[PDB]
Amino acid sequence: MGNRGMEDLIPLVNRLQDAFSAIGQNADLDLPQIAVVGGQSAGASSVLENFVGRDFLPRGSGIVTRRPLVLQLVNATTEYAEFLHCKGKKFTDFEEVRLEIEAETDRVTGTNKGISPVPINLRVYSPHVLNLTLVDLPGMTKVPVGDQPPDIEFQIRDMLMQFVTKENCLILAVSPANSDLANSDALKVAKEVDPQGQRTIGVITKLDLMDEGTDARDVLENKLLPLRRGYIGVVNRSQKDIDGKKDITAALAAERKFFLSHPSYRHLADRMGTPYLQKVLNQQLTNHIRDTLPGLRNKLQSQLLSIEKEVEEYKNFRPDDPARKTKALLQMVQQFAVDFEKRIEGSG
Amino acid sequence: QPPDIEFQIRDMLMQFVTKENCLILAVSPANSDLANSDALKVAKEVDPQGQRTIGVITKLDLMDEGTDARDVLENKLLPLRRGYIGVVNRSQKDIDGKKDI
Numbered sequence: 001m002g003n004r005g006m007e008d009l010i011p012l013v014n015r016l017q018d019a020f021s022a023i024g025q026n027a028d029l030d031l032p033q034i035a036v037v038g039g040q041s042a043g044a045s046s047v048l049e050n051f052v053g054r055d056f057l058p059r060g061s062g063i064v065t066r067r068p069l070v071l072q073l074v075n076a077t078t079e080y081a082e083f084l085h086c087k088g089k090k091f092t093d094f095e096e097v098r099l100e101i102e103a104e105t106d107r108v109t110g111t112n113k114g115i116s117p118v119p120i121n122l123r124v125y126s127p128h129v130l131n132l133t134l135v136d137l138p139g140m141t142k143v144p145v146g147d148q149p150p151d152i153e154f155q156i157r158d159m160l161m162q163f164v165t166k167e168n169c170l171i172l173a174v175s176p177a178n179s180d181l182a183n184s185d186a187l188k189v190a191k192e193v194d195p196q197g198q199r200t201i202g203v204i205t206k207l208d209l210m211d212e213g214t215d216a217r218d219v220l221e222n223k224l225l226p227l228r229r230g231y232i233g234v235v236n237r238s239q240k241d242i243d244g245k246k247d248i249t250a251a252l253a254a255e256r257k258f259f260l261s262h263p264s265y266r267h268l269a270d271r272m273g274t275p276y277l278q279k280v281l282n283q284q285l286t287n288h289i290r291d292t293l294p295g296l297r298n299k300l301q302s303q304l305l306s307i308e309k310e311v312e313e314y315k316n317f318r319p320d321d322p323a324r325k326t327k328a329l330l331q332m333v334q335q336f337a338v339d340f341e342k343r344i345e346g347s348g
Numbered sequence: 349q350p351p352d353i354e355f356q357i358r359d360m361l362m363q364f365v366t367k368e369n370c371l372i373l374a375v376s377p378a379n380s381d382l383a384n385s386d387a388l389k390v391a392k393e394v395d396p397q398g399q400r401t402i403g404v405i406t407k408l409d410l411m412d413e414g415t416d417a418r419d420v421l422e423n424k425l426l427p428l429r430r431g432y433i434g435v436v437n438r439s440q441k442d443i444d445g446k447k448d449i
């Protein structure tokens with residue numbers, strides 16, 4: 001478990017914040033939010049929790065993500081979690097967090113596969129995290145089931161648009177490997193909000209459920225459908241694994257063996273896996289934080305220039321200074337005589 | 349393929365399933381959530397009452413270990429008037445292996 005690529009980026013945020021906080025101003029470290037987009041049963045929830053590094057989300061077959069979950073990571077001296085609707089309560093075990101998520105979902109949506117556009121806000125504190133916003137959205141569908149109205153498609157789409165048309169947001173498009181990539185819904189959305197692929201990152205899931213004799217080699221090599229940032233293959237847990245409480249360590253080891261042994265993927269074994277997706281995202285934050293430094297320097301540079309002309313004199317102040325008093329006297333008298341002539345004569 | 353490939357293919361479907369004296373076979377794999385099928389959405393829009401539509405489930409040997417399609421084959425998840433029929437075809441390895449029908 002855990003995400004150790006944050007450690008190299010936490011102090012940079014602290015140092016810059018301490019730099020501005022001393023002057024009574026805050027640092028515009030507007031780190032982007034990460035939205036996970038995909039279709040029903042694509043694997044989005046499994047992907048997202050691997051970036052957080054904690055096992056707390058609900059996952060499995062069926063419509064499990066019935067409400068948008070917004071996770072806010074906050075740097076803190078101790079690790080704990082809390083909800084907005086459980087004010088005054090403290091969560092010290094993520095299993096309780098997962099159960100609360102299901103309970104809060106059913107209380108509003110019912111049990112017959114309902115949805116609700118009102119999100120759930122989870123705030124996890126920890127010393128090993130940045131101040132990040134992570135969004136876990138419901139998957140998209142075509143036809144209603146259970147109590148879903150005829151317009152279930154568009155209600156889900158609007159929930160999606162509110163979080164992906166927002167600037168400064170990484171779109172993490174997850175698609176299954178055992179379905180034709182031309183018929184993925186994630187990529188249809190990405191190419192409508194991010195035409196040039198500057199934000200979009202593709203993930204290919206379910207590489208271990210391919211039909212025998214077929215592979216995704218022309219996908220992971222960015223040949224079938226060119227994507228600016230390429231595709232990353234991942235092998236998450238199976239539904240049996242979820243119900244079997246399979247450990248994370250075993251899942252990662254199996255993912256490593258898979259890519260190292262599959263004949264069509266060995267030459268890409270180092271571009272794929274859970275840890276590589278962490279590295280790409282972390283590197284994506286680091287590029288953003290370092291791309292904003294020029295603005296911060298210019299702000300401080302402008303302020304010094306404005307203040308410098310006066311503090312040059314204040315720093316040399318001595319109360320016993322006849323020269324200052326007489327210089328002040330000549331300035332006041334010259335100001336009065338100019339103001340006086342202005343009002344009477346019209347000069348100036 | 350131009351940007352409007354989606355609506356060019358759809359306009360071809362709407363020339364054969366938008367008329368009477370026609371049966372429609374809604375084909376969809378079983379290794380994906382049935383709620384996301386494009387076959388049913390088209391059939392439901394053209395044949396709301398399910399008079400003509402018949403559902404087919406094509407890939408039952410490719411389902412993730414630990415689940416099954418009973419909720420569909422028993423016409424419970426998305427009840428369809430004429431039910432659903434499950435089939436198991438030749439894999440890609442078999443097509444290239446010259447396996448007899």
Ligand SMILES: Nc1nc2c(ncn2[C@@H]2O[C@H](COP(=O)(O)OP(=O)(O)O)[C@@H](O)[C@H]2O)c(=O)[nH]1
Nearest residue numbers: 041042043044045046059060206236237238239
């Ligand atoms: N074996 C395997 N199972 C997967 C993979 N990706 C997703 N699944 C399964 O697909 C189901 C759906 O997972 P989930 O992410 O909750 O779908 P979601 O509704 O999009 O969140 C789960 O049972 C996962 O175990 C994969 O790469 N390999």
Ligand SMILES: Nc1nc2c(ncn2[C@@H]2O[C@H](COP(=O)(O)OP(=O)(O)O)[C@@H](O)[C@H]2O)c(=O)[nH]1
Nearest residue numbers: 211406407408409410435436437438439440443
């Ligand atoms: N293993 C397996 N493969 C299947 C099954 N049904 C279809 N396929 C595969 O589906 C692939 C494409 O089928 P096809 O009918 O051409 O899809 P189409 O583009 O709609 O015609 C073929 O390679 C088949 O081997 C199945 O039940 N099991």
Ligand SMILES: [Mg+2]
Nearest residue numbers: 044045064065
């Ligand atoms: Mg989900």
